[PDB]
Amino acid sequence: KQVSWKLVTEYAMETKCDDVLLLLGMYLEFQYSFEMCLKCIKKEQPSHYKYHEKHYANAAIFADSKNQKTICQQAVDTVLAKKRVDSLQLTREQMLTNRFNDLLDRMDIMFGSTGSADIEEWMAGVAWLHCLLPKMDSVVYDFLKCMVYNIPKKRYWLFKGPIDSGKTTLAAALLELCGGKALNVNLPLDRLNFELGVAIDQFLVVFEDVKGTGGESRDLPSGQGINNLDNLRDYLDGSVKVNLEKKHLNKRTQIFPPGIVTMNEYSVPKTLQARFVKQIDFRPKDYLKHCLERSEFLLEKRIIQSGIALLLMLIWYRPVAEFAQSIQSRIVEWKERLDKEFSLSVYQKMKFNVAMGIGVLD
Amino acid sequence: KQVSWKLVTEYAMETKCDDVLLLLGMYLEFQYSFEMCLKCIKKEQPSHYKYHEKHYANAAIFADSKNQKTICQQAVDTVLAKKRVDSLQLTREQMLTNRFNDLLDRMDIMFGSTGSADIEEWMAGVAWLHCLLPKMDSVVYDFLKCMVYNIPKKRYWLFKGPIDSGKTTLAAALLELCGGKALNVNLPLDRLNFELGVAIDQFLVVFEDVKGTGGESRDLPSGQGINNLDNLRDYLDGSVKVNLEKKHLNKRTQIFPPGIVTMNEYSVPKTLQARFVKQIDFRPKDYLKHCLERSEFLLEKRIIQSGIALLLMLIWYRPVAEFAQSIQSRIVEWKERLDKEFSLSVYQKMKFNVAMGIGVLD
Amino acid sequence: KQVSWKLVTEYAMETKCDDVLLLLGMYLEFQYSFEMCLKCIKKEQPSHYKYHEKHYANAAIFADSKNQKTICQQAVDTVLAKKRVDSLQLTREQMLTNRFNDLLDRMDIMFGSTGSADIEEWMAGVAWLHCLLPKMDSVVYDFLKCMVYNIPKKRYWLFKGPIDSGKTTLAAALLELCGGKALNVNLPLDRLNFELGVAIDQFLVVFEDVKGTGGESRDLPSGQGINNLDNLRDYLDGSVKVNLEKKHLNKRTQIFPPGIVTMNEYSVPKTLQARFVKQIDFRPKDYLKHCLERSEFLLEKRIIQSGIALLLMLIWYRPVAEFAQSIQSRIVEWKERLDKEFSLSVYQKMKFNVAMGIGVLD
Amino acid sequence: KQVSWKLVTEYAMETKCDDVLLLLGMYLEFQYSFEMCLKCIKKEQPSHYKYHEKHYANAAIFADSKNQKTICQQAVDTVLAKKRVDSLQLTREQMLTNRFNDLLDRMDIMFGSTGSADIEEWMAGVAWLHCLLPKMDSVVYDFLKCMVYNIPKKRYWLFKGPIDSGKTTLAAALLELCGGKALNVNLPLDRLNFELGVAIDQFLVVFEDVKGTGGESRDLPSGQGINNLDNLRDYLDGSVKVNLEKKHLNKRTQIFPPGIVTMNEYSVPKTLQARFVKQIDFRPKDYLKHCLERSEFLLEKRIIQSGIALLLMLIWYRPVAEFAQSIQSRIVEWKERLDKEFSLSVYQKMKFNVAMGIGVLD
Amino acid sequence: KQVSWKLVTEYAMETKCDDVLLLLGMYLEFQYSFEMCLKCIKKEQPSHYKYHEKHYANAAIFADSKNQKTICQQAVDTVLAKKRVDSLQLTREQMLTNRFNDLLDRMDIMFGSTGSADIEEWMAGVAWLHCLLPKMDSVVYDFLKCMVYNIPKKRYWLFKGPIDSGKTTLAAALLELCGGKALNVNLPLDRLNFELGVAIDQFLVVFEDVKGTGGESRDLPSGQGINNLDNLRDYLDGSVKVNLEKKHLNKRTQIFPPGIVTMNEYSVPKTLQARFVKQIDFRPKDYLKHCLERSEFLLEKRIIQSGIALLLMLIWYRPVAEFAQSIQSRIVEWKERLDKEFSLSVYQKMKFNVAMGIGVLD
Ligand SMILES: [Zn+2]
Ligand SMILES: [Zn+2]
Ligand SMILES: [Zn+2]
Ligand SMILES: [Zn+2]
Ligand SMILES: [Zn+2]
């Protein structure tokens, strides 16, 4: 008869769905009666069971509509349109909070009665991660203030370390905790703009394993990253705007995003060094290594490189007033859940274990 | 009057047809009275003789529509919308089971009333395959678990061996048993990424015949494939996601898929070797070659390279509960079939014939 | 019923919105009863809280339209149609005044009731800037007349100096004060034209840090930029029109725009030198650097690189009749504002503080 | 209600408007009542005030139309269609006359009561230009006959001279007087077709500053123009047609346009020299130089390089019967205006001045 | 009311108009009352004054249509649909006759009541041409039969000679007499195919000035054209079909067309020589050059390079039955015309004048 384009757009907006084919796929499942809906009955997908009923009617009509694709388009352009609006109107903190709400959205599910996640294992992760660096929760917190504040010449951290030293792991967790893209600058000085363009509208950036020509004896490859980074002093300290290339042209003109530079121990030009407001040296630690050997589940379930592991660390160490007013009530909610589940002594034993190199859950 | 776009879509989703021109051409065959259709009477194509009846009416109206291709476009987009949903909602074991179910549909027809396949020649294929490697049936089960469990740093197998040793054959059947694309890393470090993008949305990948440097004294061409793999540690052990490309622009981001590397015996760098959790050395065997010389059908009919020969082996060796609940009813059904046609001593003789290199069927 | 495409276009032309997705997303915010809109009550975004009322009705009908993007496309095309007319019908002084009027709208909000800007920190910016160069305020007026008069062979200024001398900062504020793109001539003689096309329809251009040959003994990278400029005598002094490119094909033909060349102290060919009607030598000064060291806000808040700091200086120094009639009413309005908040002795002390290198605000 | 697509097309055709965005922009201004139209009241734009009234009604409806863009398209295709018709049907003289009418169209405005042009200054231009070469008006006239006659092997003039010798100026004026494009052939023998394609449908062409390898001692660069010109003998003498490349393919097949070759004093191969029916040597003259020094307005208002300066010279020296019947009445109109404004003696003093090197208006 | 798309198509097919913008612009001229059309009264363009009457009505309705270009698109597509049919259904002799009929339509106007052509100057062209080669009129008939018979290994003629010997001229007229494109094989072995694709659907091809290696001692530039031709034995003698390209992808497959190779006297490989069934050596002659020196019109009006001069020669020399039946009525008609204006002794004197090198018309 007459399908509602606005009812579909609603579904898209509340699913943060920007995929046309995916939107279409999702919506066509609601055409069946939800009465004997197994997907709902078995609560296998939030993006499904939480909306099937309110959409049955519409979906059933959608199923007999001649331009399903076109309808989905507008619903998607609406989501992309909202994302274009937040880009130009939200403060970075508001940005960071939406990110947090999302990661939290997952946690409710992962750790929910339907999820498969073992919260004990994810708290074994906080403990391990908390042994990777001194005052790690204060370290994570600062990075955040740094990223949110995005202040000229004080927005880049340098993670310098060997290999299997932690930098890659922590940068990965931080990357996921804040949102953002990793970038490879060890490339042809001309096939560079290509990658730099990936930074467009990204909250923070991570230049992974930058390599330098200088240095070779100690077994480190060549690469031109360090060389290139030094030619991007304007993108790094962000005093003025910059033009980014994507789609094979000149799209956005913006302040280049703040972030991290993961490095393997080369010689860094003073002109480049001056670009980083903080530098962390990661040195391999035996107990941390053995510990993993005996705590396989940490690597096997990709827990220590999860920004979710880092969001749990903040909720577990940090005070509520440190979060954005808007989210606090949801954090408190979690603290209580977490404080009802683990005693400080249990957690402390976990760190003690990581310390003696024997797997957190012993 | 008014063509039912819905029905056409139903046929598309039932035939799993993702090709617009292929769908169009097939639906239009139904426009003729089935009350005489020889294609149906003679049961020529299941994709036809199982839907002609139900679709005559609507197909008859279809052939008189002024925009049949637009209709098929939506039927197809719907098929792709589903393949997109399952791409994110289904678990790997479910992905595997769907593959399985699809191979069984193929088997139902091959060995059915209106089919050509000679099941005796296909068990001969299993017999030959179960002589190629020790505990071969445990190897395939193991491989399947490795691929489904998809655990960081334990997702790749390395098949090494001269030409005509069997790694290519098993690697092919394995590919078809699981679904997935083969890739070629023997390209210029810049042509790589295009290829690596092929793995997008894939279950598993097979790096076909990687070439190394060193060994040209033993008559082996120097290539950069090995060298590239060592620069793909990220992709191989997949501890964190990665960005894949196509259409000359970035598409999906994900955990590179797990898989196999087929190699010809070049020396391997210890850093690369470490990415393989398992290595299988193939050596050409005389009796196996002699067996084929006296059993041409195994090659001419491409049986020992077929993933169906591997699904068949599983059904023949493996215990029903080792399969997913959902599919067991269909498996027990095939075991019975098989058991009712082949005794253990008969199958046992085939293996004996291969051992003596004379002709599985002698 | 029937969405009013006209109204949507009116909003677009009033918001000066040339982005389709940005327009769509914003108009759709109005679909909610303003009789409660917190975005309005809290006066979050002027682009919203000044039109929600007037557009509720129509936006409410808009959200129920089956082709919102097509509507926005026309709204946008209309905005571009105007930017195209003024491109040919407006005089340079009018072009400049429009720029000015736009910077004042930005200032009205920055220093308004619902804004963050700290005007005291912005006059401190002016104080620091009026110490960077002698008779700085006469320099900006001069520059503006040069740019508006746009006279052949008297349209370019050359800023020379080491790094951190101030040419980059002034050149940035100047750019933003006038509008226009920066270009990079440090490219292969064939990659040039693409870049040169960027200047199309622009008011002025800024050739950022051109590099020469000679001087590598003083630690300066050899580049071909200078060399290229000498091959662009036509563009620089613009006595006759030129053909500019984009989209990989020839577009507009015109007088290349006037502008600035920022350079690092390479020797200049007498033929090139002649194209510059004015040259400004920047030398890093100690007190100015010390001033910033004790006045972080000037950098962290990007004040001394802002074109607003220059418009602010003009308003503070220049006589009202030196502006275009049309804009004077708005200028006198700002002078009063300023005069009512800062006495000459206060502003005079700031300049004194910079001289002593201690903190404009001490 | 029902907008008139033909009324908009009229507007486009009488504005010679081929710009869609521009057409749209122009037309949308007529939607407002012309009663209090300031643009009209102030007569600021002919393309506006001369048509606002006859279009009010239509424009007001156009403003509420849903496909303004589409309407404008057809109106533009109509103008492009008319231009395609004149290409294949007008004699070159008719072509040259339309050009003249247009330049005249401007003159009425420049020198009208609304324009800003000083006719005395533009007559100072004729005088100066008339001192650049002997019998200059007869020279200009001939060139025209040459260009209009476009006769095999008698269609190319060679302007050979140093620098700041006049050739560039006169070629620029001639270029504008007749219509046409400038071309750079000092390029890669393969990136040549690119430029040559610009000549498509052009009335005449000008190869600016062709450079030759031969010659270097006298301080002249290298370049490959002379080299290339010699490989285009077929494009130059135009005995037979040629294929031009634009849009990155093979568009038009036509007789290559006639024109000028501006050169800097290299060695010209006899085979190339034979390509030019006339050759003019320009040698720097002191009085002409000083004169400009004292007659800045000539260069500052881009008067001496204007084809308009050259159209004024013909109207002032040449007899009416020398013009096309169609335009004569309009020229006579101008002669009278000019003869009413300046006495032969006043003009002669102007030349005398240029002769004594002291600025024409002394 | 309702524009007649059919009529517009009829005009297109009658005008043979395959250009959309050209059709649009022309049909729109008919929208004015023909009851006054000066273009008609003055008989300016046959494409106009022969259809204005019949199309006023419909063209008047056309100018008020909301999608004129869409209408013209179909008119054109229809013209191309016909050119496509005849491309496969017509015989070569018919292809040739159509060409002929088209050249006669051109001649009917050139030498008609409302035309400029001076037939006496065109017979002078024939006289000059019939002195360029012995039995010239038999040569053209021969060539035509060769081209129409299109027999494997007997389809190509080779014109050899210095510059200004006549091969270029005859080869040009021959091209225009038959229709077909010229191609340039003096390209890099990889750029070849693009060019070779030009010959698609063509009647004949002319390989313009092929260059060889050897002879640089006689002042002849080394090129790879000859070398390429030797690698095109397949194309040249066409015993079997070939694949031709365009739009950066494979199009038509066919017998490469027959044609001429114009060469400058480079040595030829015996394998290449064999592909030419006929060779014509041109040597510059003094009397012929002197004739032109005293008969400028032959060059200035491009007469001796015109295919019309060759059709004219045929009509003047050849017996009526040597033409196709269908066209004979029109040929006898031209013979009479000619016979009624030129006596044999008059034409004979022209040939005598050329022999003495004095001016065909003396
Ligand atoms: Zn459901
Ligand atoms: Zn059937
Ligand atoms: Zn609001
Ligand atoms: Zn007006
Ligand atoms: Zn007419």
> Are both B151 and B127 inside the same structural domain?
no
- Chains contacting A (3+ CB pairs below 8 angstroms): B, C
Type of residue found at A22: L
Closest-CA distance, A254 to chain B, in angstroms, reads: 21
- Cβ atoms of D17 and D26 within 8 Å: the answer is yes
Are residues E116 and E84 part of one domain?
Answer: no
DSSP 8-state class, residue A134 = T
The alpha carbon of residue A96 is apart from the nearest alpha carbon of chain B, in Å, by: 21
**What resolution (Å)?**
2.8
Q: Is C248 annotated as contributing to ligand binding?
A: no
In this complex, the residue of E68, E299, E302 whose CB is nearest that of residue D74 is E68
Residue C260, annotated ligand binder?
A: no
Which residues of chain D neighbour E24 with C-beta distances below 8 Å? Answer: 77-78, 81
Is D167 marked as a binding-site residue?
Answer: yes
Q: Do C5 and D198 touch (CB under 8 A)?
A: no
Place of tokens 């030829």: E268
The C-alpha atoms of residue E143 and residue E178 are separated, in whole angstroms, by 10
CA of D327 to the centre of ligand 5 (A): 23
- The CA distance from A8 to the nearest CA of chain C, in Å, is 11
DSSP E63: T
Q: How many angstroms separate the CA of residue B264 from the nearest CA in chain A?
A: 27
* CATH code, domain with C56: 1.10.10.510
E strand or H helix at C157 = strand C156-160
CA–CA–CA angle D159, D165, D170 (5° rounding)? 55
Which two tokens mark D120? 């005395």
Last residue of a domain, one of A268, A284, A300: A284
B248 annotated to bind ligand: no
- Return left, alpha or beta for E67; rule: phi > 0 is left, psi -120 to 50 is alpha, else beta: beta
Residues D140 and D107 in one domain: no
- Boundary residue ending a domain (D263, D284, D305): D284
Q: Which CA distances in Å does E33 have to A22, B236, E28, E72? A: 59, 78, 12, 21
Residue from B297, B75, A277, A190 nearest C187 by CA = A190
CB contact under 8 A, E26 and D85: yes
Do residues A116 and A146 both lie within one domain?
no
**Cα–Cα distance measured from residue B330 to residue C333, given in angstroms and rounded to the nearest whole number:** 85
φ, ψ of residue B350 to 5 degrees: the values are -55, -45
Size of interface A-B (CB pairs under 8 A): 51
Residues 6+ apart with CB under 8 A from E116: E110
Q: Are E187 and E219 within one domain?
A: yes
E133: left (phi over 0), alpha (psi -120 to 50) or beta: beta
Does B have 3 or more CB contacts under 8 Å with A? yes
In chain E, residues with a C-beta closer than 8 Å to the C-beta of D250 are 198
Closest CA to A308 of A119, A113, A116: A119
A19: contact with B, CB 8 A cutoff: yes
CA of residue E34 to ligand 5 center, whole Å: 5
Give the D window 143-162 contacts with E, CB below 8 Å: 151-154
Count of the separate structural domains present in chain D: 3
Do the Cβ atoms of D198 and C85 come within 8 Å?
A: no
Asked whether B303 and B297 are in contact (CB, 8 A), the reply is yes
Q: Is residue B81 located within the same domain as residue B150?
A: no
Give the minimum alpha-carbon distance from D57 to chain C in angstroms, rounded to a whole number: 16
* Residues paired with residue E260 on neighbouring β-strands, in sequence order: E157, E206
Contact yes or no for E300 and D77 at CB 8 A:
no
Contact A24 B77 (CB under 8 A): yes
Specify the DSSP class assigned to residue C112: S
Name residues with Cβ closer than 5 Å to ligand 4, which is an ion. D 34, 37, 39-40, 52
Q: Collect residues with CB below 5 Å from ion ligand 1.
A: A 34, 37, 39-40, 52
- For chain C, say whether A65 makes contact (Cβ under 8 Å): no
Q: Are residues A145 and A258 in the same domain?
A: yes
For chain D positions 305-324, those within 8 Å of chain C (CB to CB) are 305
With an 8 Å Cβ cutoff, are D25 and C82 in contact?
yes
Cβ <8 Å between D24 and C89: no
The residues, any chain, with a CB within 8 Å of residue A61's CB and separated by 6 or more, are: A1, A2, A3
Q: Which residue of A has its CA nearest to C248?
A: A249
B interface mutation test: which of A3, A24, A116 has the most B CBs within 10 A?
A24
Which residues on C lie below 8 Å from D24 (Cβ)? 77-78, 81
- Is the CB of residue E256 less than 8 Å from the CB of residue E243? no
To the question of whether residue B269 is assigned a binding role by annotation, the answer is no
- Residue E302 identity (one-letter amino acid): R
For residue B290, the domain's CATH number is 1.20.1050.70
Cβ atoms A316, A126 nearer than 8 A? yes
D44 interaction partners in chain C (CB closer than 8 Å): 89
Residue D300 is nearest to which of C82, C151, C248, comparing CB atoms? C151
Mutation test of the interface with chain C: which of D69, D195, D200, D303, choosing the one with the most C Cβ atoms within 10 A? D69
Output the 3-class SS for chain D: CCCCHHHHHHHHHCCCCCCHHHHHHHHCCCCCCCCCCHHHHCCCCHHHHCCHHHHHHHHHHHCCCCCHHHHHHHHHHHHHHHHHHHHHHCCHHHHHHHHHHHHHHHHHHHCCCCCCCCHHHHHHHHHHHHHHCCCHHHHHHHHHHHHHHCCCCCCEEEEECCCCCCHHHHHHHHHHHHCCEEECCCCCCCCHHHHHHHHCCCCCEEEEEECCCCCCCCCCCCCCHHHHHHHHHHHHCCCCCEEEEECCEEEEEECCCCEEEEECCCCCCHHHHCCCCEEEECCCCHHHHHHHHHCCHHHHCCCCCCHHHHHHHHHHHCCHHHCCHHHHHHHHHHHHHHHHHCCHHHHHHHHHHHHHCCCCCC
Same-domain status, A145 and A125: no
- Whether C237 and C154 map to the same domain: the answer is yes
Ligand in closest contact with the CA of D35: 4
C122 and C204 co-located in one domain? no
* Distance (Å) from CA D50 to ligand 4 centroid: 9
Q: Let me know the angle formed at the C-alpha of A303 by A297 and A309, rounded to the nearest 5 degrees.
A: 140
C249: CATH = 3.40.50.300
The greatest distance separating any two alpha carbons of chain D, rounded to the nearest whole angstrom, comes to 74
3-state secondary structure of A64: coil
Q: What is the DSSP letter of B40?
A: H
CB E309 within 8 A of CB E126: yes
Strand segments, DSSP code E, in B198-314 are 204-210, 242-246, 249-254, 259-263, 278-281
The boundaries of the domain holding residue A115 are 91-131+285-361
CA-to-CA separations, E8 to B40, C208, E32, E71, E83, in angstroms, rounded: 49, 57, 16, 8, 18
Residues E300, E306, E309: CA angle, nearest 5 degrees: 105
Question: How close B76 comes to chain A (CA, Å)?
Answer: 11
Q: CA torsion sign, E282 to E288 to E290 to E293?
A: negative
For chain E, the maximum distance between any two Cα atoms, rounded to a whole number of angstroms, is 75
Q: Are residues A293 and A277 in the same domain?
A: no
Instruction: Find the Cα–Cα–Cα–Cα dihedral E83, E85, E88, E89, rounded to 10°.
Output: -120
**Residue from the list D83, D89, D240 with its beta carbon closest to the beta carbon of E45:** D89
Whats the size of chain E, residue-wise? 362
Find the closest chain C residue to A189 by CA distance. C187
At least 3 CB pairs under 8 A between chains E and B: no
> C230 a known binding residue?
no
For residues B127 and B104, give the distance between their C-alpha atoms in angstroms, rounded to a whole number.
20
D79 and D20 together in one domain: yes
D179 assigned ligand-binding residue = no
Q: Is C336 exposed, middle or buried (0-12, 13-18, 19+ CB in 10 A)?
A: exposed
The alpha carbon of D105 and the centre of ligand 5 are apart by a number of angstroms equal to 28
Give kind and range of the element (H or E) at residue A173. helix A167-178
Smallest CA–CA separation between B1 and chain A, in Å? 15
- Which D residues, 68 through 87, put their C-beta within 8 Å of a C-beta on chain E? 73-74, 77-78, 80-85
Touching chains, B (3+ CB pairs < 8 A)? A
Residue in chain C nearest D27 by alpha carbon = C81
The answer to whether the Cβ–Cβ distance between D29 and C88 falls below 8 Å is no
Q: E strand or H helix at B147, and its extent? A: helix B136-149
Q: Tell me which of C244, C263, C284 is where a domain ends.
A: C284
Min Cα–Cα distance to chain B from A242, Å: 22
Distances from the Cα of E244 to the Cαs of E81, E157, E189, E251, E313, in angstroms? Answer: 20, 22, 15, 6, 35
**CB-CB contact of A230 with A272 (8 Å):** yes
Contact A/E (≥3 CB pairs under 8 Å): no
| C-alpha A136, offset from chain centre | 18
Across the interface, whether the CB atoms of C239 and D302 are under 8 A apart is answered yes
- How far does the CA of residue D340 sit from the closest CA of chain C (Å)? 32
